[PDB]
């Protein structure tokens, strides 16, 4: 008798960066997915392991919501068994993932004529991320035989890069807001159920 706060995840003013992707926990509520259905035609709406039509008839223990902003031609990397800069260094989904991925264009909100440099992503790491793992460190990355002791220079680079969204870019370089829902069911009693 509480209703789940889906509109706070989707209608939020500010979305987080890729390398800090803002997990939220939802439990002990009635989940109404009609609001997700009625939303304007999405650039992507894919579910894994569960049919989209069979929501509102399933019960789960917890529902996690992760939100971040990526560019247009990186949306295809938010999927099980995918490889790329975003999948390897920023956000990794398990191969046996059960959930849904929603993405929509946000050019009117996250783009500035001079350039929006508030969104960053990681472009350097020694090893690939495990599923559902975050890395917010800002240490200098070593690519040579000589250490740099925290000073940038040759063969020593900062591991983060900005997007610089501008309104005149093409669809493949425009901002996109992505929400991934992870459905977890365990031996505990169910807490999230549909109407």
């Amino acid at each position, epitope marked *: 008798t*509480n209703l789940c706060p889906f509109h*706070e995840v989707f209608n939020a*003013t500010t979305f987080a960066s890729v390398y800090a992707w803002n997990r939220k926990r939802i439990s002990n509520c009635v989940a109404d997915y009609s609001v997700i259905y009625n939303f304007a035609p999405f650039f992507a709406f894919k579910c894994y392991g569960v049919s989209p039509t069979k929501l509102n008839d399933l019960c789960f223990t917890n529902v996690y919501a992760d939100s971040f902003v990526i560019r247009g031609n990186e949306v295809s990397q938010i999927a099980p068994g995918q490889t790329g800069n975003i999948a390897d260094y920023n956000y990794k989904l398990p191969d046996d993932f059960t959930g849904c991925v929603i993405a929509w264009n946000s050019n009117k909100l996250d783009s*500035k004529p001079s350039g929006n440099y508030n969104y960053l992503y990681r472009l350097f790491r020694k090893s690939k991320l495990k599923p559902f793992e975050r890395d917010i460190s800002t240490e200098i990355y070593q690519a040579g035989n000589k250490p740099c002791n925290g000073v940038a220079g040759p063969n020593c680079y900062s591991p983060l890069q900005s997007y610089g969204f501008r309104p005149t870019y093409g669809v493949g370089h425009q901002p996109y807001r992505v929400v991934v829902l992870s459905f977890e069911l365990l031996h505990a009693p169910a807490t999230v159920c549909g109407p």
Partner: antibody, heavy 127, light 108 residues
Framework: QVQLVQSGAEVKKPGASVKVSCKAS????????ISWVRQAPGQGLEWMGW????????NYAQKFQGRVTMTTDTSTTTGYMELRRLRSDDTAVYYC????????????????????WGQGTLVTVSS | EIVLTQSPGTLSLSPGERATLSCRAS???????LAWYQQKPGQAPRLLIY???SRATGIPDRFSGSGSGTDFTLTISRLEPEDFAVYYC????????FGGGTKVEIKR
């Protein structure tokens, strides 16, 4: 069919306190917060505070930091505001509005405004 | 805190004309944290525009909004007799504040 109904007009004296009510019907009460705004006679709108109907978190304006308290009752779907140490310049019409600016569960900004308003309660402070 | 200035205070226009209202901020305000309100005399305010470009429920197509950064505008294409009221702008990018208010009158 969202409606908010407030209490009637009150006339008080300086130094006292007044409690204004606001009853809501037609929507899930715990999914939205409540914000309070007052308008002095022949003046503009000024913000007072915000309360969450899900966990009781509050966020007041600095001008009313130590005088105003806000409470909600889920059983009767009613919000309350109390203003202590009433002054001569607190005569205004007090409004109650459903909120779409701060989230009730997590407490973060949303895209919207005050979507629904009450009818207003006039408070008069004079000796 | 951020202070909003509305100009002009009064805007005398004839019915059927177009209206332009200005809301300016001392700092930069995100386009997703601006709104407009309408208040007819002896009545409670109502929401018109949220997000600086989106109309609310049951709002005609006459009202439109556009702007970015520290300059925002509200446009009324045609002035019906029930559109003569006081208009306010507000933001919640940093705390929550209201503007002074602009009054639209009838010219004769």
């Amino acid at each position: 069919q969202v409606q908010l109904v407030q209490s009637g007009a009150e006339v008080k004296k300086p130094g006292a306190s007044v409690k204004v009510s606001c009853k809501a019907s037609g929507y899930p009460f715990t999914s939205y917060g409540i914000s309070w705004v007052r308008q002095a006679p022949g003046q503009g709108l000024e913000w007072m505070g915000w309360i969450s109907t899900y966990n009781g978190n509050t966020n007041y304006a600095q001008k009313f930091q130590g005088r105003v308290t806000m409470t909600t009752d889920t059983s009767t779907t009613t919000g309350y505001m109390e203003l202590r140490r009433l002054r001569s310049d607190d005569t205004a019409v007090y409004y109650c509005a459903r909120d779409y600016t701060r989230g009730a569960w997590f407490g973060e900004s949303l895209i919207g405004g005050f979507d629904n308003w009450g009818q207003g309660t006039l408070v008069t402070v004079s000796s | 805190e951020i202070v909003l200035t509305q100009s002009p205070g009064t805007l005398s226009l004839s019915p059927g004309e177009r209206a332009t209202l200005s809301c300016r901020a001392s700092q930069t305000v995100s386009s997703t944290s601006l709104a407009w309100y309408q208040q007819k005399p002896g009545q409670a305010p109502r929401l018109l525009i949220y997000g600086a470009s989106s109309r609310a429920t049951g709002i005609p197509d006459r009202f439109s909004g556009s702007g970015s950064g520290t300059d925002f505008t509200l446009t009324i294409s045609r002035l019906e007799p029930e559109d003569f009221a006081v208009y306010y702008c507000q933001q919640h990018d940093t705390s929550l504040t209201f503007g002074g208010g602009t009054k639209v009158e009838i010219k004769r």
